[PDB]
Design a protein around this ligand. Structure first.
Ligand code: NAP
Ligand code: NAP
Ligand code: NAP
Ligand code: NAP
Lengths: 330, 330, 330, 330
């Protein structure tokens, strides 16, 4: 029987998770909790400024019908303690609100029929897994984190390149699309750079590179650090890794190592672009990272720069649902 | 003695009102209520992605020092009933939060030293005045509205052109910069077009043209209607009036009527651009409307199109403080 | 046999015309003249920042293979007098360069196998036709113009509404995406507003409304005028008609007149949006105009505002190829 | 007597060079060659979408009057062989067209009164100098290059950090505003990524890091490489250096080394931002590089990431005029 999931929260990631899950024959979306009105939820699923149009219908009983998920119950309850997925018999919650990113907070979902929660973000005190990196270490934990979109792009690359050449240290920059955490126009924010108009500025902002890699690749965590620069694009981001290796490298040898991994251990997760594409070309791409083959470069015997694209909404959401399928069966 | 004002709310309009008021020798900003931390408030006053840099300092006692307002008390209380401007002896509140846009709601400010409130938006059941249009009809009301930025641009023009040529009917479109009411990326909104990414789309949205003009120009209210189109610019808007008159008009005669008004009854309020400028050129302009002289056109004997720029933040904020000065002395 | 066309010029309109024509079973694109290198042309056909990805292949003999056009000869000759489509046996040229927009200039294509030219723009001294408006008046002219994208949106609407209610006068504004005629950053231009950065500004610019309507709807030409405002979107535009009629109108009656026309005389040309969409939703739409049903409004007995979307690249290009099919058979 | 310069070409860099030079009491702009009409040139000098408004006047004899340059002759001759600055007695040409970036091409300016040329770009076979890096090695060469804006930002930083810690290798990424070399919408370009719409995409593009550093810091040239990512901002860029040193470093020690250099050998050239600003805050900044103090980071004993802002138009133009003053007196 298809795995019975519910999506909590219908902003960018929840909307993308709905669309992704609707296309998976082994999944059934049995419920969605949204703070939007039903008709507005349907409208947002159907029409996306970046990703285009999507088929979705309202059944006669006012459940939704999307892809393989023909009977989706729509809820609207912000209070996680009042929220009740029982009428839908949900087993796995995809937690996409941004408001319960901790073990303690998301553990409130564990009641009634619900067995497991996957949090769409780094989460305090929560077992963290990245598909293709450390997901096989999963051991029946009931609440897990799928890390960040940047960690999903960078951890595969670090694992591949460490296995090939042995990472001594690396520095990461992500040139990253703006998100709904940012401000349209200059106004209060906890981060005084994210305070500033997102569409007008280059905005350096921390990202917890060292700590994230430490969770999924413990040996590499102390060896890497980095930051983000938010820029005026609405979706698709670019990780830029500057690496120092133990083994000597060339542009060609780095290219070959990455291509080999895409054929083998990272098939479906990492890809290679040899066509000289730009960010908009990767809208809706399902990969965690798409290496920019022609821009790989080396200097000295031991250093390389590797860039890779990722659709920070869709690649991540594909991984969320990959992880739901994995933890249900393992 | 300078008029003692306090600014409630420090988003776009509150920040602009602070800067404007700081430059008026007849005003003293005695307090600001902000949900930002003090250092963040100071940072936002000083550095604006659109308007540039502004001088502002922190005094030794942690009041702010800005222009002619050398001793500004900073408060941080969201609850209007707990908020207390007494230590600053504020007399007029400039209400800029967007959360108390009604007579009943803003009347909560009327306590202690506070005599009057000016609301930075249309407000339910509230006496509404536009400077240069109907402000001389003010009659000591304690809570008033300064209408919208679009009404401040369009009502002067309608009054001028009606006086000259007699408006039979008019249709208004504003091509308007995005605001913080909009969404960065597609997500819930009460208005399903304002739901959609502000930086990516042309977004038709109602604006209550008929009702606003009815308040400030009662005879014209039943004769005009219109709408807004939000577009991907961060500031500066453009009103487009399509008018049908009783008297015959030419491009020249419309031009002359508008220019004459700028010399006389609308001096300092309406201006004329003869230099073929574009929207960015009007950042920080203090006028309610800047007519685009060369783009005036007529068709038939009786119809004209008139365009005018306005800085929807700064022109409006200049008027807010003009109105504070007026109601304090009248 | 399919109609043998060649596309001259591969900028925005030429690229779109290629894609459109490739999907028409009654057309064969037998040649393309491009100033790009072959591989770059193929790349531009395949990958579009706005319109997404398109299938296109290089045959073993280095002709292109796109849709129903399996053997497209690629030329690269800027000089219209040296350019020779003979090896491809082209019969109709779709002239998309922007550099030969006159009867005299485009008449240089009339040699060898070429019978007819359709110019992708208003053109001096050239018979002008808009599909659904006056195309049935075509009378075997060898060089014609397909007018502008704005005329293709506005002339259908004016014809519909005139037939229903009798236009006395109308004023048009188009809120229009930027085009490659504009400047990325402030620099020389013949139009000192189009000189200014396209992505940063609202840019009023003439458009020859009166003269265009005069060509296709002679009785209405003296009754209408208007202008354009270029804004920071890359594609999709919005026409805003403010009309004064002889017959009395209501919002409902205008809505009904437009809907009826879409079912009948403007089927496939004009459509109606009842779903409260925004500009990005109309990317790649084939219609000349998509009326915004909910934003129709009236004031007084005789005046209405009507808005309609159009994809200024794709709707226009669909019409270009519609006109090629029509003039080949008529 | 003030140094008599002429500016050849009035796009972004030429316009900025005019404005900069006009404010230098030791310079006289005696002529400008522009392909714009005189009134359009004046308009572009006066009104800038990014940099704001500038005072400039037309004298009675139709020379320009700007700052300290009260009698500027305006020419309009594209052909460098016909162009003649004799009536103005120009001694130094600031070559800003982008069309003569070679020793051979720019040597055509050396005639009549002209003694020296400074090219606003890397130039083939041309002695290259960066102010504060290697300009004191100037030895009366008549045609020189001022390198690129990125080299002006990165070479000071590399020199400072090499002197302090000894660079073993470095990798550079510049997150760079779009320029007029790019395309508004997807169309032909020699670089198939720069072909794609500048305002819509992240666009990786080569930049000749290794070769440039080799010219100005020969010992470091073989040790560094990198690339650019063009993004949707109109001005202000960010260099991101990932460095491996011989000496051990900390965040603090890197911070201190950079701050010390700004007080001493790079005063007026490199600055430090301790105020957590964003890109728009550096519009019109005169520095070659503004280090982002709080975002410096280290990993391992030997690696650091250093970011720095630069206004790619204005910082560079300040250096152009600094170099004109230097080569005139040395
Ligand atoms: N690229 C990305 O966007 C990306 C990638 C990976 C992970 N993430 C992470 O995923 C999380 C969500 O990000 P997002 O970009 O999707 O944010 P978003 O667009 O702001 O969406 C979050 C949504 O959650 C809703 N919500 C808040 N509290 C709720 C509640 N108690 N019950 C139901 N709905 C509630 C909000 O609605 P209201 O406005 O009504 O409160 C909002 O629409 C964040 O932690 C983020 O860091 C984002
Ligand atoms: N062009 C314009 O922007 C324009 C022109 C004329 C009039 N208006 C009107 O003016 C109002 C404000 O607009 P805006 O553009 O300035 O909005 P904004 O940028 O969103 O600013 C509003 C600010 O109010 C703060 N706030 C909310 N509740 C508060 C409270 N109880 N006490 C103190 N601060 C509080 C918000 O902070 P939190 O996020 O912490 O809640 C926010 O920073 C709206 O009614 C708008 O329609 C705007
Ligand atoms: N929305 C629209 O974009 C739109 C809609 C309707 C009509 N139009 C009209 O259609 C025309 C083309 O507009 P567009 O937007 O497609 O412009 P565009 O993107 O600038 O494309 C024009 C292309 O023509 C090429 N070209 C110039 N001279 C040529 C020659 N002699 N032979 C071959 N190719 C040549 C140019 O290449 P080089 O750079 O190598 O010269 C350029 O790539 C204009 O008249 C425009 O007004 C445009
Ligand atoms: N950030 C920057 O923008 C930056 C920084 C440092 C260096 N640079 C370099 O400086 C150069 C200029 O760049 P830019 O950004 O200023 O380019 P731009 O904005 O395109 O300006 C170049 C100008 O040169 C004019 N021109 C071309 N040939 C001419 C001639 N023979 N005589 C007179 N004027 C002529 C062009 O006018 P027409 O269109 O009429 O031909 C155009 O307005 C390039 O080599 C660039 O790499 C740029």
């Amino acid at each position: 029987m298809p795995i019975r999931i519910a999506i909590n929260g219908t902003g960018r990631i929840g909307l993308c998770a709905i669309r992704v899950a609707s296309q998976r024959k082994d999944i059934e979306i049995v419920a969605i909790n949204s703070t939007a009105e039903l008709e507005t939820l349907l409208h947002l699923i159907r029409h996306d400024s970046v990703h285009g149009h999507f088929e979705a219908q309202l059944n006669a009983d006012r459940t939704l019908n999307i892809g393989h998920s023909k009977n989706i119950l729509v809820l609207s309850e912000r209070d996680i303690n009042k929220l009740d997925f029982s009428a839908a018999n949900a087993e796995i919650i995809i937690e996409c609100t941004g408001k319960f990113n901790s073990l303690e907070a998301s553990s409130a979902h564990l009641k009634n029929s619900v067995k497991k929660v996957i949090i769409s973000a780094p989460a305090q005190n929560t077992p963290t897994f990245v598909y293709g990196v450390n997901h096989k270490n999963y051991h029946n934990e009931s609440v897990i984190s799928n890390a960040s979109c940047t960690t999903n792009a960078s951890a595969p690359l670090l694992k591949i390149l460490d296995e090939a050449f042995k990472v001594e240290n690396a520095l990461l920059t992500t040139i990253h699309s703006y998100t709904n955490d940012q401000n349209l126009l200059d106004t209060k924010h906890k981060d005084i750079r994210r305070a500033r108009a997102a569409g007008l500025n280059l905005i350096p902002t921390s990202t917890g590179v060292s700590k994230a890699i430490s969770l999924v690749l413990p040996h590499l965590g102390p060896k890497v650090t980095g930051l983000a620069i938010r820029v005026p694009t609405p979706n698709v981001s670019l990780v830029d890794l500057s690496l120092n290796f133990k083994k000597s490298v060339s542009k060609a040898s780095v290219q070959h190592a990455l291509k080999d991994a895409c054929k083998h251990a990272f098939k479906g997760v990492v890809s290679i672009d040899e066509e000289r594409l730009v960010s908009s070309d990767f809208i809706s791409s399902p990969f965690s990272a798409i290496v920019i083959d022609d821009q790989i470069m080396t200097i000295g015997e031991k250093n390389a720069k590797v860039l890779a694209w990722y659709d920070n909404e869709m690649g991540y959401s594909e991984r969320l649902i990959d992880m739901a399928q994995y933890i249900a069966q393992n």
